[PDB]
Nucleic acid binder design. Structure first.
Ligand SMILES: COc1ccc2ncc(F)c([C@@H](O)C[C@H]3OC[C@H](NCc4ccc5c(c4)OCCO5)CO3)c2c1
Ligand SMILES: [Cl-]
Ligand SMILES: [Cl-]
Ligand SMILES: [Cl-]
Ligand SMILES: [Mn+2]
Ligand SMILES: [Mn+2]
Lengths: 675, 674
DNA sequence: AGCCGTAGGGCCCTACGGCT
DNA sequence: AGCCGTAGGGCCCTACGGC
């Protein structure tokens, strides 16, 4: 893949490292083929600080870099055997390019340190605003990044070797705590020309950029709507295109393309997979996407290519987006500044706990189980009537997690500790039974598997335990699952063998029993925070108060404006002859504006609304419609002002709407909790 | 492997379904009955055994997986008793490509498992139409409509005449194209366990796929010179107004919009089509303006469509000009939820301007690009003399003009190609011999032939030098750059004749390449081999029809607006009685009737009055109405004049074509040496 | 050959944290 | 010692005709 240069004089040669062929194209097209070589990599490279040496020396990209440099590694390193005197790191100008840069620097530092000490490692500075170099034209990339007469390179300098070792081991090592602490200490949450660059400063700044971006803008959900940026951008994308349940499905290809061009500047696989997960009833306790086609199965089967499937909203997603266009939530600019996206959805039901979450960030992660919507809402209502409610009282309503795959939970200890601190292991067990099958023989029937368990992989594991004789008593192992019966895994037992013992062994040796490690970390005020049940419900309730409040304010301003216009039009109808006369005798529409305003004490917008009136509106029924709309509008205004007068009426309104959602979408519990 | 076998092991009641891929294997595996129904997902088009040799067949993954799944062997080692299933159900997608796949599968079974067909073990599923594939259906639907034995409708393949079957498979699937082309020409019609004869299935399915590829994939239309994918792309860029004046648009949005609206096929085909249309070394007149990495002459593909952007070129507007003026017939799309153009107005001769290249079924096409100035000059000459000959046209259209410049040797091949539609044209690189210091010389190549991969050519030369198949070359370099352009340097050994080396390179490398002109195009939706004059004729007739329908559209529009303006002049002449008439009316319908009866107004006129905004009652508005009405009368007169005499119509076509020439015409790039 | 260009179809490397 | 789920990145079979 290396696109070497013509010259073979390392003193004037230089190799550029890019993320892939999408960038290698523009780079190869704009380069100077006499003294500039190009090595396209394949995305994220291996982290040598965590992987073992055998895996490093067998990695394709690593070996290709060693070959390209021809200097060796470790003790066999020879600076004189360098085929280039400048190794230019030129990743994409994004957070992932920063991560890649930190990985590359780690490799060079752990296996080619003299290359850094000699000042052979440089950093290219492509302009910002591009998702990658593949989006830039060749001439632009040449003039702004590669042309020696205009480029601005940073030469990597190694000052303190001890602080460098500590930095690389801290940020890239396998000890998470040091990294989390670094983030906590340095994270700044938002509410020709060859400069030298200290490798420590570059590692800390780049890795901090990637880490922050992953924490606040990728892996972790927001406590208010319980959504990550990709899911939020997906659903909003389905909203701006009117992909409502009443209207037909929409082509998944169009959805992913629109979302990717407008809001989510990342690969299609991430978006489409996210939507697929949101459409699967075995993954989402309350699915947010209605899918047409093959959206996978419990056996790990992925979804069909997006070019075959379609999707629209679910009825409850409408409740996630309800009132989003009434100044309830703050919009923000997108990545390219050509669109507006919601920073959060109204989330008229507690989504975070309803569907749960699970994300692997940097220096931390999150794992929240789903719950029953009825129980959640009942808990919110109890909290609204008692700010001092305790966790146990909440648990009178919220018995515990409620997984879409049903199943069993052993004991409330793990639940209790998880709701009281935000961390706790919960023992999930399949629903299995023992029954006869004729001739004094027995079998074990599994009808419900644990949450996030691959059924086919489980059955495969059992087949292994049977083959290796690591479990005795099993004679046959079938999977009679079907749509007309549901999950049904049959495990024949050998005659005269105790099936309960075999079952306990299966619980001990297979995913038939799995633990869920609750670790409820979520974004609060745009900051990662470990929260308990009460805090989550509280932040959600506050979000609801703010939502309904801002909605009432919006509807009030709108209603008042419409009331003013309707007043202008009612005046016009009371003096239609005077109006017509005023207009006809005016040469221009501006003169008509001024004359109407001055003669009828009308505002600019009222005279404008009169000038825009169609003659058909002078028919009787149209006048009646205007009057009626005005009176009803006065009543509506009075009701709104009533809501904004007393906070108890507002809060009770939140209670009423939450109760409506509960009565409409609430369902029975699926997962049984045994004492 | 990918096989998802069933629980039972009794072949008499077992049955295996063959699907095109995993997107369908998902729905099939979710909706099946896992006790007696197995599933084998393939990987798209399988190998055509009628054409491939045994070594290639026995190393194909899908073939071997099918043999394994059946467990019967192949050839003479076939044993029906070892069959793991008694029903091999072919269930490809309900489309033309699924029909092609079906013919391939049937071919394999017939040449390697004939007793399986004789015993009636091969069946064909009949999934409902309207889905791009089974991956678009839900599992319950697929089960109830196709797999459920209590309602499905299978076709059992029966082999009656073995001789006619052999001749059929050798004819449709064999490696002799002429027989296949003849079959298409003779049978192509261009616009519950039933038994099914394998011959009828092969002929019908293969004819379906063949027709679809000929008229709806590989071959262009003579009028706009576009294939369905390019037309649907450009139209897609037009429905969102992604014009050159506006900023670029994300390629992902373009491909998604086109694929959901018009082109129900893979994203790779669409995106590659747009990329080619954006490449200045591929299109003599690029129709797409690309932002990002859209490839190079060294075969380097374009960046993923998540990085690149694209909009129209200024000349594409001339392809779309007057589209909304009833110039071209619109049609329904594949799902019946959209309208697409069957052809673009094509205000300049695109087919010959950018050329074409397509591999269909039973035939193919290869048309070189040309110079727009010369083409237009030829069209104008033709409009003044229907009896013009090929040589006269060649007085204007000297020959092909490739975007890569280059050289063409002699007009013999050109002349034969323009006269008959078929002809070889010798393209030669632009090479020179120059000194490089110390009595040594080099060969500098600055222009390569059309559709030649520069890096691959250089590799070929390196091979000839390494293999000692050519003497005199000492070094080889590619000094190409944006500041210089194509520049391949070939050092010559001192005291060696460089002209001989250059001639040898022309004889032994792509430095000289042949272009096999084979101008086949769709005329009235039928493939036809055409010459230069015929192409120019069909195009000119398309222009005449376009401008005619445009003039008619503008005439009807102008007359309608004049009628409305008459109504409005009446309304303003009696504004008081109008207002009173409306006020006394309860409903808008009553007002309509009263106005019509009291002022001799039509429905649309009274409607236009009722929809009039009060701002239109200012004094100056009446004057504006009068002026617009008079100018409209003059305009009507001009239009009717144009539609009265065909000579002024043709002269208008000449005027617009001349304007296009003056705006977009450019100099010739390829030199033609005698 | 093996390439041209529209079509069918699909799988494998990496980072990151926590639990097993 | 391997999975969960958002992210970075990419390559290889096939049909079809003509030279
Ligand atoms: C599929 O299995 C493999 C196996 C091996 C592969 N080797 C290299 C390799 F690059 C790949 C993949 O990139 C090939 C391909 O590109 C990316 C994906 N495009 C799908 C798509 C469709 C429609 C769209 C869209 C994206 O974006 C927005 C608008 O509409 C799918 O996969 C490989 C893939
Ligand atoms: Cl934290
Ligand atoms: Cl209106
Ligand atoms: Cl079409
Ligand atoms: Mn990138
Ligand atoms: Mn298909």
């Amino acid at each position: 893949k290396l696109a070497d240069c013509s010259s073979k004089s390392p003193e004037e040669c230089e190799i550029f490292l890019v993320e892939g062929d999408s960038a290698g194209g523009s780079t190869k097209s704009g380069r100077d083929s006499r003294t500039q070589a190009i090595l396209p990599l394949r995305g994220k490279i291996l982290n040598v600080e965590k992987a073992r040496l055998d895996r490093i020396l067998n990695n394709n990209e690593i070996r290709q870099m060693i070959t390209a440099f021809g200097t060796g590694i470790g003790g066999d390193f020879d600076l004189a055997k360098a085929r280039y005197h400048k190794i230019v790191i030129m990743t994409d100008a994004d957070v992932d390019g920063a991560h890649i840069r930190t990985l590359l620097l780690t490799f060079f530092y752990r296996f080619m340190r003299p290359l850094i000490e000699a000042g052979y490692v440089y950093i290219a500075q492509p302009p910002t605003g591009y998702k990658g170099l593949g989006e830039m034209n060749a001439d632009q990339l040449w003039e702004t990044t590669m042309n020696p007469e205009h480029r601005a390179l940073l030469q990597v300098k190694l000052e303190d070797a001890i602080e460098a070792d500590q930095t690389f081991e801290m940020l890239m090592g396998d000890v998470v705590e040091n990294r989390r602490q670094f983030i906590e200490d340095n994270a700044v949450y938002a509410n020709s020309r060859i400069n030298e660059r200290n490798i420590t400063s570059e590692m800390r700044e780049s890795f901090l950029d990637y880490a922050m971006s992953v924490i606040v803008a990728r892996a972790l959900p927001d406590v208010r709507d319980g959504l990550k940026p990709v899911h939020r951008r997906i659903l909003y994308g389905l909203n701006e295109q009117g992909m409502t349940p009443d209207k037909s499905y929409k082509k998944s290809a169009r959805i992913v393309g629109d979302v990717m061009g407008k809001y989510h500047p990342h690969g299609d696989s991430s978006i489409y997979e996210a939507m697929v997960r949101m459409a699967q009833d075995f993954s989402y306790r309350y699915p947010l996407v209605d899918g047409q086609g093959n959206f996978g199965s419990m056996d790990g089967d992925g979804a069909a290519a997006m070019r075959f499937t379609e999707a629209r909203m679910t009825k409850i997603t409408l409740e996630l987006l309800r009132d989003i266009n009434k100044d309830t939530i703050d919009f923000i600019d997108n990545y390219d500044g050509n669109e507006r996206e919601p920073s959060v959805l109204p989330a008229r039901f507690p989504n975070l706990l309803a569907n749960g979450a699970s994300g692997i960030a940097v220096g931390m992660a999150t794992n929240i189980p789903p719950h029953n919507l009825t129980e959640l809402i009942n808990g919110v209502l109890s909290l609204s009537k008692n700010p001092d409610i305790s966790i146990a009282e909440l648990m009178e309503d919220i018995e515990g997690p409620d997984f879409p795959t049903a199943g069993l939970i052993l004991g409330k200890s793990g639940i209790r500790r998880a709701y009281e601190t935000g961390r706790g292991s919960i023992q999930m067990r399949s629903r299995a039974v023992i029954e006869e099958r004729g001739g004094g023989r027995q079998r074990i029937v599994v009808t419900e598997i644990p949450f996030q368990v691959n059924k086919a992989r489980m059955i495969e594991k059992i087949a292994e335990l049977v083959r290796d004789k690591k479990i005795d008593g099993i004679t046959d192992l079938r999977d009679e699952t079907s749509l007309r019966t549901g999950v049904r895994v049959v495990i024949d037992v050998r005659k005269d063998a105790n099936a309960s013992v075999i079952l306990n062994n299966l619980y001990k040796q297979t995913p038939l029993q799995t633990s869920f490690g609750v670790n409820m970390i979520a974004l609060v005020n745009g900051r990662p925070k470990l929260i308990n049940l009460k805090e989550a419900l509280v932040h959600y309730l506050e979000h609801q108060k703010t939502v309904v409040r801002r909605r009432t304010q919006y509807n009030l301003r709108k209603a008042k404006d419409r009331a003013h216009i309707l007043e202008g039009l009612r005046i016009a109808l009371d003096h239609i002859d005077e109006i017509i006369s005023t207009i006809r005798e005016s040469d221009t529409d501006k003169v008509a504006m001024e004359s109407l305003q001055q003669r009828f004490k009308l505002s600019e917008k009222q005279a404008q609304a009169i000038l825009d009136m169609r003659l058909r509106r002078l028919t009787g029924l149209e006048r009646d419609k205007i009057e009626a709309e005005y009176n009803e509008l006065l009543n509506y205004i009075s009701e709104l002002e009533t809501i904004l007068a007393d906070e108890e009426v507002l809060l009770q309104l939140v209670r009423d709407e939450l109760t409506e959602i509960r009565d409409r979408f609430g369902d029975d519990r699926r997962t049984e909790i045994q004492l």
